[PDB]
Every structure is written in structure tokens, then in C-alpha cells.
Symmetry: D2
Subunit: 436 residues, 4 copies
Amino acid sequence: RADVAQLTQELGTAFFQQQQLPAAMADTFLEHLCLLDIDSEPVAARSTSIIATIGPASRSVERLKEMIKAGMNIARLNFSHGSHEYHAESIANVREAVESFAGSPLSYRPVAIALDTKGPGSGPGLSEQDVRDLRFGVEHGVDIVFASFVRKASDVAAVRAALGPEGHGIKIISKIENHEGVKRFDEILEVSDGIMVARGDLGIEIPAEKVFLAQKMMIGRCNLAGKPVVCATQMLESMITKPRPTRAETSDVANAVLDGADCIMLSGETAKGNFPVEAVKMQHAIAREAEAAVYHRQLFEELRRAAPLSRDPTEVTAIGAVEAAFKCCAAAIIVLTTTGRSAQLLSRYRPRAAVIAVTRSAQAARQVHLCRGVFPLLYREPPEAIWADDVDRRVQFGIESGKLRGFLRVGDLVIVVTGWRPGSGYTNIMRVLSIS
Amino acid sequence: GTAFFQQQQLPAAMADTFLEHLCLLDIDSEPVAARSTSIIATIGPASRSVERLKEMIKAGMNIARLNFSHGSHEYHAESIANVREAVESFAGSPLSYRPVAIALDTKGPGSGPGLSEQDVRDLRFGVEHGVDIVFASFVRKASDVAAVRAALGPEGHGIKIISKIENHEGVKRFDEILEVSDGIMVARGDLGIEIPAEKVFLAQKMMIGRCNLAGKPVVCATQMLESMITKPRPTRAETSDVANAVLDGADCIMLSGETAKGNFPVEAVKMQHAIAREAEAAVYHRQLFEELRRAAPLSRDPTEVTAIGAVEAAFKCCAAAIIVLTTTGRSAQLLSRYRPRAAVIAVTRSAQAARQVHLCRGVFPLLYREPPEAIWADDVDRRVQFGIESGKLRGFLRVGDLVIVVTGWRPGSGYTNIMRVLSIS
Amino acid sequence: AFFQQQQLPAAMADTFLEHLCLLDIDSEPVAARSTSIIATIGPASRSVERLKEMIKAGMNIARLNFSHGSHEYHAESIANVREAVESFAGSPLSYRPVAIALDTKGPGSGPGLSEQDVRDLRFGVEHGVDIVFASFVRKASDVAAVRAALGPEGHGIKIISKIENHEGVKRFDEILEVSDGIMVARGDLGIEIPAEKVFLAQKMMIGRCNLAGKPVVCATQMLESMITKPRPTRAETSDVANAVLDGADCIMLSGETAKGNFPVEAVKMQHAIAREAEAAVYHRQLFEELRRAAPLSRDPTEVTAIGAVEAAFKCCAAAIIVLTTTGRSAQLLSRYRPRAAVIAVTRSAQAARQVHLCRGVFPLLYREPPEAIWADDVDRRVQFGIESGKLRGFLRVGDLVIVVTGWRPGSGYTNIMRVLSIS
Amino acid sequence: ELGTAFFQQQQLPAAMADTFLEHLCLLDIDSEPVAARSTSIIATIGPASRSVERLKEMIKAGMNIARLNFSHGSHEYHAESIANVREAVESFAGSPLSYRPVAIALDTKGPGSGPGLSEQDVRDLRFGVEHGVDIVFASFVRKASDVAAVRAALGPEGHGIKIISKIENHEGVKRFDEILEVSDGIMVARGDLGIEIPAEKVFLAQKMMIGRCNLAGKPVVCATQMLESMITKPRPTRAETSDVANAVLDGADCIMLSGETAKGNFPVEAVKMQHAIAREAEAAVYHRQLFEELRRAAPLSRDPTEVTAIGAVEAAFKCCAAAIIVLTTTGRSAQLLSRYRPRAAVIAVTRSAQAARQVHLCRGVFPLLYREPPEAIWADDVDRRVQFGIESGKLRGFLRVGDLVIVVTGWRPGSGYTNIMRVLSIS
Ligand SMILES: O=P(O)(O)OC[C@H]1O[C@](O)(COP(=O)(O)O)[C@@H](O)[C@@H]1O
Ligand SMILES: O=P(O)(O)OC[C@H]1O[C@](O)(COP(=O)(O)O)[C@@H](O)[C@@H]1O
Ligand SMILES: O=P(O)(O)OC[C@H]1O[C@](O)(COP(=O)(O)O)[C@@H](O)[C@@H]1O
Ligand SMILES: O=P(O)(O)OC[C@H]1O[C@](O)(COP(=O)(O)O)[C@@H](O)[C@@H]1O
Ligand SMILES: [K+]
Ligand SMILES: [K+]
Ligand SMILES: [K+]
Ligand SMILES: [K+]
Ligand SMILES: [Mg+2]
Ligand SMILES: [Mg+2]
Ligand SMILES: [Mg+2]
Ligand SMILES: [Mg+2]
Ligand code: NA
Ligand code: NA
Ligand code: NA
């Protein structure tokens, strides 16, 4: 207790009874489980992003507005079904629903658009349909590609080549769907931006009883590499027909978050099901509960022990900022980022504190949804004449959005992460600030 | 030789952190050990046939659950007769005979504040028909367990009482309930309606952790393979749920509609068996054993002291099994609480203890039928040899394997105090 | 080559046992010596010429034992120490501050702070001593009497309570609470309690001081045989190494420097052993345990300190440069025992002297002209830390350093940590 | 059932701590040691400690191993020292409470230069075999071939003599692994080591060698200048008491006295001081981390003696066992228990007088020489030896009725079959 006694006197016992903080303070994983409390309410914003597949049940602008409000962060377009005209209309509807909230930039929630490819089929690699669909993606400015049936590093290179010179900024998330993809995982992760554990095909390609081993291994390896990992397929399957999920489905969603997944996905549940909005709301409710149940004490210790020494100032600042956030129970870590990289490096240490990422790049704001606990804020103001004042205005924008979004209150401590000069790659500063 | 350290997730077992353990999990590393998490199958119209029950026993069913929320006493007496006929059909080959427990799951208190009159009648029927376990519905406080125990009367003292936690009050009063119960059931069906659905996993993980700390059996129940009531293969969420219940530390996993009324009762049992085997090999024993040891208090009880020594010895040599002689099952339960990787082969003359020890993870009961040898030390050795011969026939043991043998210094329950390292010949 | 030195193979070990197995006599220490050396000034070490050699050998704190000698004698010792210290002031990038500590005679027959101690404490204030080593502290009220005897002009003097008997050990927690630090005074402790129990008292007190983040001094008979012999015994080198491994902030020399035949050699020996022992510290366990035990805090200096030490370990930072007025920001970094040297840039001459009490804090006294813009003044003090660090061998071009500063002037506002590449 | 007082003695509050830092913070000068002293004391025999009367006082003070330094004195001088040690030891053979085996160790002059074993070392090693010494402390061992030369010189009759390799220079430290592999144990010979390598590096060599020996399960001796000032002064310095305590905390199986007992004015007081400090330091060992690390670092084993030893040590910790009674012919089963550093005393019952003397090299092993004729029924002979261990334990203060003990035996007679651990209640 002496390690939390002064902070308990200052913040109160009510603060320390919420968000599974009694379980967080435990000295062993066993004691942590024993202290999990159904009466300990989650307080933090939901950190695991929700990917919802867009289809006939979730295509209308009106329905998409409800889905964004329910918690959808990434809209998935499954190119296994529908024409280019159909998907272009889905993209337009998503963009219309997203831009309907651009009224106030303080609450504007960016939504990424992901293109999920049909796949190689009987072919040994990049199909002609995938080449056409990937070209459509670049032309329509998609943020992410979920590349189907990635079996080796050369499959990812073929996807990158098909995106051409104009699609260099698009994130490639390799879908691991068969035995070869699992066995060649390391070479695939090395050349990918992230991974999707595509359990539908994986569960038919390898014995169904082995899928959890592949899922846990891939999530662990992605967490170690600091690259986003998506858990997908049949997470809330029964909700395609019923308004409430089974006990196995709620458990699966909670366990994907506890495993370390950055994102969780909905397929038939939102694309064609009877309750698309309810499915998004259910993933949101479970992820909030499960994130608070993460045993950060061991996770942070293990991420530090396993991660190699780094001479990169962004990485060095990120670990210092996460350590500082844990020391004071910081409400948030506000970070300025051009590409999303500084926010991704904070996310890899899994802080309890929300990572509020302030960026001018609309694409980076959408793409950072791939990183757990990163809350993107799109800054729209033109640059100030003095650079230091432009940095300060962006930090204040993060604070004001954080106050109005519920993340921050007067009296809270926040960690602010910035760099010494303009441009990407120069993050090197960490500040402890009292919110006024 | 060399292939041995490739199997049963041994590369992941040797890892220095839980994160690296996860990174080393291999879909090609085949499980070798026998499946340690017991399977409880609910009996109903889909699974009452004596011939279908024989297939369920072969598939891996260890405990037959009788749900007294449906059917009369006449119905449940027929279910018991059918289970006993199917189980006893294998008694002609003692080396492969698998005991099967019979559990009575009560209707519950309804709108009442405690033990119902129907529950009193059902509990007496349970004693009269010799059931091994009671799964007491809606246990909300310690007095509910005392009322169940009193309704079982003087003749039902040996029946195990597994308290079902199904509502907010049961979760909040968990410690006082566990203290007076033989074990717990995380009854997720009612729990998921009584508390928010998104909070059930917290209740399940807490209860399993607390039962593991207390060394008392814990059952994970309801909708684990729900889609298998009508489909031949489960969903990805269902296989994950079964695997995670085992990784959480559940001693038993259960099937309800999947075996009582569904079209795939045998396949549901086979699926739980296949998943549990994979998940048990994926347990990070290095941390689990260390934490169970650190949390367990010092003990002056020789059975408890021998059990921790035997489990430590089994991990040191990668023992294929710990062979234990037991009258009540207690010596096997105390070995099970330290979660050894080695199968705990429990040799007993008590048909009831043989059935009840299925509640304890990794305990493989063998019912010894022979009358005692005149020389007690020779009778103990004959039982150890029966454990070895059964283990060999069932694939648990081979010549060259090391086994830990746990026995006592005198006849009768409560005197376990010896651990021996034996090479299988 | 980098990873072969300063016991880095042993530092990477997964257990304390494997760390011991990987210790290498060929792995040379590269970091500057972090444990301060306290040398007792007496007939063998009073000359200005001798004191210059002692400062060069590694003496950081000059102890005046008021159990012997008059006020006139000690005033002359103080003047000689100050003359020797100030003779190196011509090179500001290499100047080493040296603290002056007054070790009291003690209560004797007990009851009441001695009238001799009242006079000696007033002498200390008048002569501007940095530290008081208060003899035979048995309870919190003894520290209060020492503080009261220092008066209004002595508020800034650090009180290091000497634990010398059973009562002091038993009432340790209440003593530490009101003291700036502790001295494990093994001479009297070894006569007051059984000789074979002193190591238990030493290890307990060092552990509790490390937990509290307060300085702890190991003292007496560390290199005893060096009073008459040019080389110490095997037990003496082991004792010095083990005091550093136990977690002592300072190590002391008494008769070895006050009256011995080899005072300079004794200082050189403590310096050589301490540097080897500091590299042999198993930081992986020490940092984790200190981090887990240090309470959660909303004080920005405490929050910045742990973030800075974590960042330093992540990049193998050559140093943590910190700006400090009172020494507090450097003390809060020192409590986490970084491998990186804590270079404390200060304008206060007294704070520069007193921070030698905290392990791994290298004080630099800032004497460069002031800048008109506060932001430029801070930057120049940071560049001074870099320049002094380069000259002294702490830093080289290409090294990474962690820089710790505040958002406004004055003490108590440290809240910034920056990762900086040298040149 | 143990009482409250039980958990306050032998640093049990510090033993229960969750971190090493918390363990240090909980060390208590008022928490009295209760266990018997486990670190053996080696005393060098010389003019100050040669008389039968002085040796009797040294045995009473705690001397377990008598060291004969063949760097000085003739074969006739050392034969008289050996006879005096044996006379002093056998003078207690009447009283079971006072009789204790004492090993005799021959410390060689060394190679000086040359390319192999010196002619003097060959003759001195032959003298050792002829006079039935238990241990050889081989001076200036630099490589594995130096150990093989000592092993060869122990002739056809002395293959059972333990070779403790003395590491005294840079080459010995650098070639440590190959030396330890072929040796029975190691001596950290700090006198020469402190002249051969920089004085400030000796502690690194000491801690490294003790750690590697602990990992290998082989005895390690800390030697030279431990209580140096006691050659002329009746009490040691603060650095000397610290050095003894830290050698025990480092993991040394034995501690040594050289000039302190060979020529000093206070030989008996030096032995008493080492006994007093070792008892305090053994209780201060952080067993929770030590056992966990020894467990994690030691490889998996299919040797039943090793498997039984770890099970027995785990069981001893679980019940706070007063002792682990082990039957051993060569000492190996006691050595394998000792490597896991139990807090419980390891009472080793043996018929071998040589094994009884030699097991003093292993920390926490209390040898009991058994001389009853063998029973016709082997199980009866085993039971009689187990009860001999219990009754000796009761007489010596290790055990009382109601205590729990762990008993380690094998399934058949002869060395190499240890495979049984039992939990017994003392009646
Ligand atoms: O995370 P990224 O892509 O490296 O961006 C971080 C960069 O953002 C900043 O904080 C602000 O940069 P800009 O003013 O160019 O937007 C830089 O100081 C820092 O290098
Ligand atoms: O586990 P339990 O019920 O305590 O039974 C263990 C008992 O079994 C035995 O091994 C054999 O006893 P029996 O010969 O009476 O079957 C005893 O020595 C021991 O006390
Ligand atoms: O360690 P201390 O005593 O709190 O001093 C730290 C202070 O030093 C500074 O870095 C510089 O302050 P000054 O300009 O007054 O010297 C402050 O920003 C900070 O509050
Ligand atoms: O430690 P060692 O030399 O292997 O001796 C252990 C041996 O002692 C015994 O316990 C008793 O053997 P003996 O009857 O031959 O003395 C054996 O069962 C065991 O193999
Ligand atoms: K697809
Ligand atoms: K029921
Ligand atoms: K004094
Ligand atoms: K010699
Ligand atoms: Mg697919
Ligand atoms: Mg129910
Ligand atoms: Mg004194
Ligand atoms: Mg020598
Ligand atoms: Na996110
Ligand atoms: Na089972
Ligand atoms: Na000993």
C-alpha cells in the first residue's frame, strides 16, 4: 500500500476502486485475476479500434452516422463481393457520414477506409482482379489495404507494387489465413505495416482447435514488434440474427483485447446482419471492460525487457513518457505527429493513459486508428508565423478537445510529447503539465 | 531424444517472459499429454440412449450432468440407469475402464429466499440414487450451501457440493460461498442476464483465479460451443472461449444444450477434448507454478508437503506422470492444485472417489477392483503396477519414462507422506 | 567494444545468479566514480599541498572530527581545504566542489545536547559548513535539538544522523523521517551491539535509506590497515566493494586520512574499488525494485525523474544533465540509481557541495555570464554541462544525453525531459 | 501451532519479503539465529594451533577442516600436526553430543615455474595419500591439465581425495570454467590473487567464482585475510566482520583462517568470530530469490538423486522442516541437497568416515558417522540409520518431538540409487 498511499489520499479511494485499479496494483498475475471486480467501472475512453464491414445492412449515410456514433473507427470494404461502382458508392456514403461531424473540429472523429482484397485463389500470388481492385483503392484514396491470403514476403511486395507510386502512404495489413502464412509469419511481419488474424479461412486451413495458438502467437509477435494486429471473424457471429451475443462471443472479444489486439473486427455482423449498430456497441462495451482488466504491471515490464536498447530519440522519449504517465496516473499523453509514428511508439508500451495524437495529416489521423489507445485529432488551422507558437496552439487544441471529449479535467496531469524542430522524425521532448 | 522438446509447446514453456512464451506458441507442436480438463456433458433426449452414452464416454465425457430443471424423478432415474449401464459396459477390461461421475444440477430457489421444497425432494432423490456431485443453483450466500448440505442428510456426507454463481450477490459473497463449498460453477447463462453481458468475463476470471488459489475445483459453463446444437463445427469465438477457459485455469468445462438436445452431442464432446488438449500444453507453467507456490501458505500437513515436493520433482525431470494412491481423492486434489504438467494418475478402490476426482484438473482416475494382498506393502505395489499398466495401455507411459509415485506410510486416508522417482520398465 | 566494458554482459543477465557468473575482471569501468568519498582531515592531511593531492585523488567531502582539536585548529583546517579547492577555480570546466562536514563530539553521559556540541554547531554555522554528521542520534528529538542549535542562519545545513547504538537502530524510521540522511557509524555500533550483527544493521539502514531516497554513508575501518601499510587487506577491499553493492551513497575514511601514513593512497584505493563495484551493480533488478517501491506521485519533479531514468537506460545515455537550485531535482534522479552520470548544473555553491551526498550526482558550479532571455540562460547552462562533461571524459560526440529542466525560474518547477545527441 | 515467536527468529520476517530491497529493509539485529551454523570453518594448523589441548578448543569453537600448509614445515612436522588433530578429534568419541568429524586438507606449495607439477608437490601429494588426507587444496591451478597432474599424483590409492583448485592468478580466473569442470571444488585464494590482479578487482573474481560454483553445485571456499587483524588483536575490524558475512551472503560453502590460526595470538577467538558471523549471515540469506534462481538456472535432470533433492528441498521450505535427513555412502546425495541451499540442516548419515569428513565442504551438511553392523534385512538397516539421524538430531538440538523432517533414501543398497523423499513427524 505505501506505494499508492499518498496518491490514494490525494485522488480518493473512489478513483482507485474504478478501472480495475485494485487488480492493476497486484504483485502477481494470479492475484490480479483474483482482484478483478464486476463493480469496478471503466473510466478511460475505449482504446481498441473497431473495424466494421460495410455492406447492405450498413451502407446508408443515416446508418453510417449511427455506426460512427456507436464506435466504428475503420470501415472495411470487402472486395470479394460487389462491383467497383458499389464500393465507390459505399466510400462516398462513409465520407458523407464522417464529414457531417466536421462542424466542430474538437469532436470530429476521423474514420479510416480499408480495402479487403478478394485474394489469389488457385493462383500463386497477385491475381488480375486484385491488381484492378488495388488500383481502384489508390484512385479512391483508401487508407489501408487488408491483403488476403498473404503467404510470404513476396506477396506483400506484389501488393505494394500494384499500389504504384501514388499509393506509397497506404498501410498494408497482411491477412494470415493458412499454414504457410503462419510458418512464414516473421518474414511477412517484417515487410508489412501490420497483421490481421483472419480466423475464418485460418479455421478451415488449419485444425479449428489450433486457431487460438496462431492468434495468441501473432498478437504477441506484433506487440513485440510494435506493429498493429487485428483480430477478425465470428467475434459476435450470433448477432447476425439475434440482438444479444452468446457467452462465448463476449468472452472472445474480451480475450482478443487481453491477448493484445490493437483492433477487433465485425464482418457479417455489420455487412448483412440484422443488428449492425448493436454489434458495434457490444464490441465497444466489451473492449472498454477488457482494456481496464489488462495487467499493465507485467505487460510494461515484459515489453521493456524484450524490446532492444534504442538510440532513436522518438523511441527513447516514448518509453520515458509512458513511464511518467504510469507514475502519476496521467489522464492522457498528448503527442504531436506528422506520420503517426510518435503516437505508434507510445502505443507499443501500452499506457493506461489515452494517447491524444494531434496531426495536420487527414490520412495519418485515419491510419493511427490501427494503434491501440491512439485518439486522433485533425488540426485544421494554418501555421503560425513563429513555430514554437504553432506547437503550443496544437498542444492547447489537444487539451481543449480532451476536455470537451471527457478525457481531461482541470487539475489532471498530462504528459506532452513534442520535437525540437519541424518535420517528421524529431520527437525528443516530454513535459509534465497540470491542466488549467 | 530431440523431437521430445519440439512437442507439447515445450519451446514456449522454456520462455523467460509470458510475452515470449506467447511468441513461441507453435501450431505444429503437437500435444502429447492426456487431456486434463474434465468434460461435463448434460444428459437429455440427444444423449440418453445407452449406445449413444457409450460413444460419449469414448469421446471423453467425464461427468454426466442431470438438469433437474427439466423432467421428473422417473426421467432422471432412467438417465442414471442408462449412464451406469453404458459406463459398466467397459468394466470387463479394468486397464482401460473410465469412471464417469453423475452430477445433479438443482432447479434452484426461484422467487424464494433459499432452499425450495422441490430442491429438498430432488436432493433426497440424489442421495437415494447415489449421485456423486450436486451443482447447487443460485447459491447467494454461505447459508444456501449449509441448507443444501442439510437436505442431503446423514447419508449424503460424501457428496461434493459445487456452488453455482449465477447473480450479482453470489459474485459479491463469493469468498464466504467458496469457503463452505467443495467447488464453484461459473454459471454464465444466468450470470449474463443478472449482470451486464460485457462483465461476465471479469466474474469468470476472478472466480477461476480464486478457486485456483484455494485449490478447489472450478467449472466454466454455458454456451461454450452453442452453435454446435445445430451445426457440425463451432464458430471461431466458441473454440477461443473453450481454449481461454482452460488457460484461465478452469478444472472442468461444460456442455448443456450441445449434449442434452442438439444434433452433435458426440462431436461437441470431441471438440472440447481437442481444444482442451491444445490449450493445456499452451499454459505457461513457469509462471503458474511460481505464483501458486508463492500464494499457497506454509503447511505442516504431510499430504500437502509431499504434493508440492512431488510436483517440483515432476517438473525437474519432465515426468510422464505422478501415480498417486488415494482413498478419498484428497492426495490427488493436493497434487492437482499445483498444476503439474505430468498427468496425475489416481489409483483408488473407492468407486465414488474415482468418479469425484474428475472435478480436479489433470487427475486420471483408475478404479482398482482386486481384494487386498495380505502384505500391505505388496498391495500398495500391486496398485502402483496397475497404474503403470493402465498408463501404458492408454498411451500415458512408455518404457524409459520417469514417473513420480506418491504413497503413504500406513493404510487408511490421510497418511500420504512418500514421493519416489521411478523409471518405467 | 562498448558492450564488453562496464560489466555490460553481466548487466544483461536474466537472474542475479547469472549476473554474478558473468562478472569479468577484464571488463574495464568506463563511467565516472559515483560513490562520494568522505576523508577525515587531521595532522596527516591538513597541508594545502596534501589537500590538493587528496582532491585530485577523489576526495569529495572533508570531514572535521570535533571529538579532537580546538576551534582554532578546525578553522585552520577549513581555510586550508578552501584554499586547496579554490586553487583549481581557474579552469571552470574542470572545477570540483568539495563539501565541508562537521562531525560532532556527541552526548556523552546522555541527557541533553552537549553544551560542547552547542558551541561546535554554532562554530559550524559561523564558518559556513555544508553538512553536520550528528553523533549518537537515538531518537527524532535528538535531530530537532541539532537543528535548533544550528539556529536561523543554519537552516540550509544538511543533518546526517549517525546511528551508533541499539536505540538508534530500533528507532531508525523516526530518525530517518526528520534527517537529511544517515551514517552507519560502525566503530561505536560494533561496540554497542554484538560485532557479528553490524552487517545486518548496515544492510537494513542502507536498504531503508535507498527506499526513502535519502543519502546513506558507510563509515569506519573500511581501509584500517592503510593507517600503517601502503596496501589494504583482502577484507578491506571487499568491505568497500560491498558497501557500494549494498547501496551506500558515500564511503568514508577516518584514521586512514586523519593520522595515517598513506592518506592519498587510501583515497585512491576507495576511488578504484568504488568504480569497479558501481559497474558490478545489477541495475536490471535494482531499478525495477526501486521503481516498484517508489510511491505514485503527482509532483512533476518526481514524475520527470523516473521518466528521465527510464529514458537513460533505454539508450545507454552517457549522462542525465539536470538544472538544480537546491539539488532536489538531482537527488530525485539519484534515488533511481541510473547507470548514467547525473550532471547537476547549479549556481548555488553550497548546493554543489552538498549534492555529493547523493550517489552518481556530479556537481558543476555555473560561473558564466547571465543571459537576458531565461530560455537562452537555461540552454547555456545545458551547453556548460555538455562542455564540462566532454572535458572530464563523461561525454563524447555521438553520445545521447537526457536533459532535465523546468518551465519557469526558481526551485520546484522541474517538468521537462529532452533526448539530446552530443554535437 | 508453531507460536508467534517462531516467525520472529532467524530473520523470518526478512525471509518472507517479496523483493531483495524489502528483504534488506526487514533484516533485524534482534532476530536471533536458531539454525546450526552451516558454513564450514577451515583453520590452518601451525605453531599457535598445533597442541592437542589447543586443537580440542578449536574443535569446540567450530573448526570443521584442518588445513596443513605444505609451503612451510617438513613431512615429520605435518605428520605430527595430523596425529595431534586426530588425537583431539578422537578425544570426543565417547560423548555423542561433542564428537564431530574433522577433515584434514593438504594445501600444496605450488608450481612456482617449471611446466608441470613440482617435484615437491609430487612428494607432498604422496605424503597426503599415505597419511589419509581427505582434501587437497591445489595451489596456483591455471588450467585443466594442472588438475589432471594433481589427480595423477594421488597414485593408485587416493582417487577418493577431493581436489579443491586454488584460483590465484589471471590465467586461473580466465580458464575458470575448464578448471571447475575437472575439479571437485574451488578456493578463491585472495592473497596471491590480490597481488596477481589489481587489488580492486578481487571482489569481482570472488563473486563470479562463488556464483559459478553455486550454479555447478560444487563447493567453493573463500580464503585469506578474512580476520587478519586478529593475528595481534582480540577483536576484528568492521571491514573483517563485513567480509566474513559477505562471503557467506555471496554463497561460499566454506570460510578460511590462515595466519589467524596458524601463528596468531588469538586462534580460538578467530574461529569463534567466524562461527558467530556465519550463523548471523546464513539467517540473512534471501532464500526466496536464491532457490528460485538456482531452480531456473539448473537444467532439467533425469538423475533420480537430483530430482529427489529438489523435491526434498521444496518440501523442507513448505513445512519449515527442522532438518533433511539423508543416507549417503559417498556424500553425493547430501551434496545435491546442499546445492539448492535449504534453510533446513542437511543431516547426512554415512558409514564412510572419509565421506563424513569430506561433506564438510558442502554448506549446511552435518555429517553423522554410523558404525553399527549391517542388519540382515536391508529395510531394517535403513530404518536404524534414519532413527540414528533423528536421535542424534534430538541430542544436538536440531529436532524435538512434533517437528517435521524430510527423509531422503534410495530403493536399493549401494551408492547412486537415491530416489525417495518422505515427510516424517518426530516422535
Ligand atoms: O511522429 P512524426 O511523424 O515523427 O512527427 C513528429 C514531429 O512533429 C513535431 O512535433 C511538429 O512538427 P511540425 O511542426 O512539422 O508539424 C516535430 O517536432 C516532430 O518531429
Ligand atoms: O488421499 P487419501 O484419501 O488421504 O488416501 C491416501 C492413502 O492411501 C494410501 O496410499 C493407501 O491406503 P489403503 O491401503 O488403505 O488404500 C495410504 O497410505 C494413504 O494414507
Ligand atoms: O532542483 P530544484 O531546486 O527544484 O531546481 C530546479 C529548477 O531549476 C530550473 O531548471 C532553472 O531555474 P533557475 O533559472 O532559477 O536557476 C527551474 O526551471 C527548476 O524549477
Ligand atoms: O549419496 P550416495 O553415495 O549415492 O548414497 C546413497 C545411497 O544410500 C542408500 O540410501 C542406502 O544405501 P546403503 O544401505 O548401501 O548404505 C541407497 O539406497 C542410496 O543409493
Ligand atoms: K476478402
Ligand atoms: K438447473
Ligand atoms: K566525532
Ligand atoms: K601453500
Ligand atoms: Mg479470408
Ligand atoms: Mg442457471
Ligand atoms: Mg562514533
Ligand atoms: Mg596462494
Ligand atoms: Na486507436
Ligand atoms: Na479432468
Ligand atoms: Na558446513
